């Protein structure tokens, strides 16, 4: 310690530290585009989604409530968007 660049820290330092502690805080969550196995209708889903996000087309759950990131339907396809 005793000599640092708090302004230009290593990206590893950015990743390891808890949010709200970085120089600028950006939520570690993100948004994903997901394909339901039944209908081809793509849907956008928040990473730590709270309520079960059924597609508007059909009663098919895509995420399940969980303390952290929601658990998917084991068949749907997610991509980071």
């Amino acid at each position: 310690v005793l000599v640092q660049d708090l302004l230009h820290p290593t990206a590893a330092s950015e990743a390891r530290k808890h949010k709200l502690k970085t120089l600028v805080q950006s939520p570690r969550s993100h948004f994903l585009d997901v394909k339901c196995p039944g209908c081809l209708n793509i849907t956008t889903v928040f990473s730590h989604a709270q309520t079960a996000v059924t597609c508007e087309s059909c009663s098919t759950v895509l995420c399940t409530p969980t303390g952290g990131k929601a658990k998917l339907s084991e068949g749907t396809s997610f991509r980071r968007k």
């Binding site: 310690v1 005793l2 000599v3 640092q4 660049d5 230009h8 820290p9 290593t10 330092s13």
Partner: protein
Amino acid sequence: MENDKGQLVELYVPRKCSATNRIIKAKDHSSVQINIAQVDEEGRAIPGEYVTYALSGYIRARGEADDSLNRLAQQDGLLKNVWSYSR
């Protein structure tokens, strides 16, 4: 420290730390004056020539003296990327 007439009334103008730039007391019995002899191209240490670094007692006591001297060596072209300004 200085009189009007133009003479230094202050006595034994003292050194300072080369790492924290802080003053070294007369009886700071931990401060160390490291001397690094210069080296020419073919690998001979030049006698009577060197570079000096006055590490303070406080940094030695805290234990962060080695990192400080890595920094001084790197900034003065004594070592190659031993010390990274980022962490």
